[PDB]
Design a protein around this ligand. Sequence first.
Ligand code: CL
Length: 292
Amino acid sequence: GIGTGFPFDPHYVEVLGERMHYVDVGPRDGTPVLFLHGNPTSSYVWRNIIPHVAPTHRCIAPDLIGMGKSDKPDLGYFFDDHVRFMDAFIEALGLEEVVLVIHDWGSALGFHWAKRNPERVKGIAFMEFIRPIPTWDEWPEFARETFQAFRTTDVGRKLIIDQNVFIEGTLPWGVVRPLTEVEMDHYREPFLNPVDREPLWRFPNELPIAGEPANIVALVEEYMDWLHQSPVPKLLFWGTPGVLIPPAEAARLAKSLPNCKAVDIGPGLNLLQEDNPDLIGSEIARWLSTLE
Ligand SMILES: [Cl-]
């Protein structure tokens, strides 16, 4: 049975006038490992992978601004907002060199930070990450009508903000195996008040789909161009059928990206961490040992 508890002691750092929550476990020496979550999760999504890495490495998993146990100021919560906060989070913790373990929107932050700081990244493990979606035909059929609704200010805000559809609908429909009530309540916890659900709506409105928004497509195309050139060791977890990364796209990127190893986790949609945390955690620890 996949674990449901969150036993990590809370840590907080002040940043741009707000406090951000982060997990900090493992031995201090070595290269720290930085876990970046996405929408609509938090560091809770890493709770069963970190125990495979914490024996030998320091594990840092922050809650994005406006999410988890972090502060929730009245922001627009655009992707630029998360960039400015994650930039100053990494600097506030004195993280000189890091290994990235990123997912969903945490991967957009991780890849964009790596492009701007390539000398400070010693490895990138990633899964179901932000890539350009050329047309809506490359988006999964069963989720197309829902995400097109999300990307409007009338229907999309009614579903995500008023009815909490991204937590009540999108989250369980992004995991193959059934979630428990305790696991749902952990994801419901940061967004009990509808006024705090702004990040849950802006994030899908930022997804680079069909060239829109053009500023996010351009940004993702740049760090995807840097990925193809960089020699940084890469670990690519993928699931079947997946959501953002279909198996065929993972097969192409495993061979086209330099020093990229691909791992099949079995059945999976978007939250691969909830479908096979033991394989993901153990494969990260093994892969870290082959980098020294
Ligand atoms: Cl999203």
